[PDB]
Symmetry: C2
Subunit: 592 residues, 2 copies
């Protein structure tokens, strides 16, 4: 029930100072952190950068694999000019679980390590003095929290995780920490939808505030020129001769919201950039601004060698440099909400994102049978609400993914899907498509939930998990056989392939190819391309993965996952040049 997830801005009514830097850090295996006073703060631990996953900074494995309570400590200054304002610490992500103490006093908890949350500390600090913030984070996985997984205990006592997902359990203060001072009466939320008529457009907005003061809304273009204004919390901004936002061709207008009448100084100002564009599913078409498009891309994680799962602006800007070069125009934020700065860059660069909530693991290799479904569901729907509230105004969000590879064959999955889909059908004012990925075991013959998603996202791995090597010929025929069945039943919704590919160890070559070589990656991708091109209802290809990424140790995991088109260092495998050639030859309206 987060009152507001607006991204921090700086103006005369709102301040935002980052608390990033080095913190004190201590493990707590015994769980006696609070018994012995760590919540008042400490400086007898190890320095830990923020934001950063804490796991890879340690040379010993038990610390890399640590599972339990852990503590971050820091001092921060509160200016005396802040007295009277609404004061918040905004945590952009604490994986997975956090209790926040300021000066020894408990402020709040939070569940879910991938969305932001703020702590009202207005009453917990001395103004004009140094205060202390302590974070008691937790790490464990259970089937009652997203991402789904288990926590086991080695015979020697140490806890460790057995995830139901691929990626590594990178943990800790994974994203920035802000100190905010906001007006007492302020903007909490706003919403935008768009309509196009001829060369003109209309933004339809609403604004939520914690009070009754008047609301002025003003829309300015790229050069600061005001082009529409309106009064009140509902309204319609008329933009004549609009500059539409276009795939791989962004145009962003600045939106400005202010509280007060013209006898006041503005009691609050908020500011955000939005793109004027519309998204419709029509038949099997995905329409952006009423012309069909064809998705090309990935397939991503937030993973980097030094930050773990933490947001790094350098790695993010290179991922976009690469993705623009290679011809992509879309990617899915698998398998969890990304740092907010990523959606701002997709807006700036004209990319189409599939925003995913962290519901991986709904799949035991009897899931929906059990009793952890009650608590799991609360957290799932709550994480879906907060995700849609945070990112709804980004032009680059195209669709919401509400599961990843859930067990759709279990008939008991249908009551759960009915509930999730019912409870979310109206969260997004733009009413974009809501979907999920179907795993390989989940086909037109075996899935029970094919009626729900607004378009289809298939995860197919012929040539890797099935029909590998010289059997690849049988795998293509068996995929063509499935795609034949969709066609017969007459798919009325678009189909998008969202995973496929091949683990590839850069530098491994063979002629002829063998699984794991660079040549085999290309043969596999060429094979998929031949299938995609032979069916009109296939409307996009998102390969797995963009880069190689870290993973839980295992005998099938050559240090992480290696399915990337690029290495973890962000350099290209042979498959990168394949797609660089294919994707820059496919137009935006491919198949139409």
């Amino acid at each position: 029930m987060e009152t507001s997830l607006l991204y921090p801005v700086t103006n005369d009514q709102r301040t935002d100072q980052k608390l990033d830097g080095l913190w004190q850090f201590k493990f707590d295996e015994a769980g006696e952190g609070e018994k012995s006073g760590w919540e008042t703060g400490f400086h007898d631990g190890v320095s830990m950068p923020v934001p950063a996953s804490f796991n890879d900074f340690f040379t010993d494995k038990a610390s890399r694999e640590y599972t339990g309570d852990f503590w971050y400590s820091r001092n921060f200054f509160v200016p005396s000019a802040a007295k009277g304002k609404a004061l918040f610490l905004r945590f952009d992500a604490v994986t997975h679980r956090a209790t926040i103490f300021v000066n020894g006093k408990e402020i709040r908890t939070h569940e879910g390590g991938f969305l932001p949350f703020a702590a009202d500390i207005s009453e917990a600090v001395k103004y004009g003095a140094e205060n202390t913030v302590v974070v008691k984070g937790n790490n464990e996985l259970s089937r009652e929290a997203l991402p789904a997984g288990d926590t086991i205990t080695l015979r020697n006592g140490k806890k460790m995780v057995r995830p139901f997902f691929d990626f590594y359990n990178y943990s800790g203060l994974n994203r920035s920490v802000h100190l905010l001072s906001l007006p007492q009466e302020r903007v909490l939320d706003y919403t935008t939808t768009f309509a196009l008529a001829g060369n003109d457009a209309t933004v339809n907005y609403t604004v939520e505030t914690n009070g009754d003061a008047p609301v002025t809304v003003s829309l300015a273009d790229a050069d600061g020129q005001v082009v529409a204004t309106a009064q009140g919390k509902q309204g319609a901004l008329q933009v004549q001769n609009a500059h539409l936002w276009q795939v791989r061709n962004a145009y962003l207008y600045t939106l400005t919201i202010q509280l007060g009448d013209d006898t006041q100084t503005p009691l609050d100002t908020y500011t955000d950039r939005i793109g004027i564009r519309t998204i419709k599913i029509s038949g099997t078409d995905i329409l952006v601004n009423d012309k069909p498009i064809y998705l090309k891309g990935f397939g991503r994680h937030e993973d980097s060698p030094f930050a773990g799962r933490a947001f790094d602006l350098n790695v993010e800007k290179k991922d976009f440099a690469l993705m623009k070069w290679i011809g992509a125009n879309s990617f899915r934020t698998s398998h969890y909400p990304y740092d907010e700065q990523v959606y701002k860059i997709a807006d700036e660069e004209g990319f189409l994102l599939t925003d995913e909530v962290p519901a991986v693991g709904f799949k035991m290799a009897s899931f929906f049978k059990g009793p952890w479904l009650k608590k799991l569901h609360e957290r799932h729907i709550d994480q879906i609400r907060d995700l849609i509230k945070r990112d709804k105004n980004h032009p680059s969000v195209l669709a919401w993914s509400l599961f990843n590879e859930p067990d759709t064959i279990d008939e008991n999955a249908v009551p759960y899907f009915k509930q999730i889909f019912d409870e979310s059908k109206d969260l997004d004012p733009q009413g974009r498509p809501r979907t999920f990925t179907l795993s390989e075991d989940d086909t037109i013959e075996t899935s029970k939930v094919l009626d729900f998603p607004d378009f289809y996202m298939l995860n197919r791995y012929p040539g890797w998990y099935h029909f590998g090597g010289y059997q690849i010929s049988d795998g293509e025929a068996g995929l063509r056989d499935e795609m034949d069945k969709w066609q017969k039943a007459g798919v009325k919704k678009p189909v998008v392939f969202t995973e496929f590919g091949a683990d590839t160890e850069a530098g491994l070559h063979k002629l002829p190819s063998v699984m794991w070589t660079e040549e085999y990656q290309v043969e596999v991708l060429k094979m998929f391309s031949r299938v995609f091109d032979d069916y009109d209802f296939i409307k996009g290809e998102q390969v797995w993965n963009l880069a190689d990424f870290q993973t839980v140790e295992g005998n099938m995991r050559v240090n992480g996952n290696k399915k990337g088109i690029f290495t973890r260092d962000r350099q290209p495998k042979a498959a990168a040049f394949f797609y660089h050639d294919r994707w820059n030859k496919l137009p935006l309206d491919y198949k139409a």
Copy 2:
């Protein structure tokens, strides 16, 4: 005296002595004073054929320089009493003395051409006998290939070559025990002419007696199509199947000694291809049509045998060269095992046969007292090479130096002499040439009148104008190509080295030197240049596969300029040539 390859029939036997010999180093030079020439069994087992270097875990052995000893027992059949008995050594790198049953039979200089020892009177027919080989692998400016031997401050001897490849040494090729007739074929020659659909093989036969000679040619199905009598003669082949590039057809030649009445005294058989080679101004003509050369760039180098011939690697190297569209290669920088040419003959490849005249330059050379003995051994190894490989249809040209220092005006007497003393050795009179290094250019080279066609070694984008400078390196190469064109070049030009070290697995966007992408970028550049000039009639890239090399800070475990890895898998540049070369016809530029 005879370098014919061994064959098996009723007059001639041939049995390999390959396998595990005994082996000992002789750093002191006491082996003969110690009685080792009588054979020994107190050393280490060593495969033959194979270089001995890579079988030792200590660097002192791997790098050993000096006298080393091989010893083996072998059985001489009773049935062989009365024939000419021979130990034939296919290659002993670089120097050998041969002992049988402790008796010194013969010595040999040069480590890449075969020699035979007559052991007819040194054996006990019907029992075991001993063969011991005393080898040496020192280098000096008086032997090919050229280099120096130094002593370290700790006494140990170490080689410092004037060439790139590693000093792989020992019994690098098979050892045969031969049984030959007392009167036998020693040599033969072939030359060809064409006329319509008919051809003429012009042969001669060298013998060590006066018995009559009888030559017959049969086609691939065994049908006889021409006979002749006499030590000189001409076989008339009606409606001949010509030997074509990447399209071989081989006739079987059979030489037989003795008149129509006696038991046959000797039989010798070989496989030849009917085809002609002419340099017509600026074209290379095979069967009177112009060709365009594409290929490598090779070494005899494999992980486990070293320099030694390994038939598995050779058939694999050939499988790859056909896959990639190539049709030629140069046996840099020394004659190869004789099997390489027979496969070349069966696969219709064109070979440039190179004598180990490498390292004739320092970092001058033709201004030293070593030339006199160097030249002795040089023109002798030229004679042995042409005598051995004459009759192969697949040998296109002879290469008499690799990267000699032709800038000094003193190279000119020596070239003059080498080129006069080889003038009339090859009966087919194929073109004689050599490679010009980066420093030897139209502006600076003093031996440009000698070669029959020009072989160019250029490394823009690697040893000069690397990295972002590559564009200035391309411009300089076209500069030099403009000056050749200005100088009115009348002989053909073939690029025979160019390329870039590449560590398989190193990727960068944009590229940096040593990555797979940069190599493709460099090879594309050279291609752009080659295609804008008509006198350029061939591209032989360096190198086919990563090969081993002396240790140095620029050698990342050997040379890495190879299109394929030392294990013979492709780098990205493999697929660039696979695309390009399989689209250039055999008559590109005509």
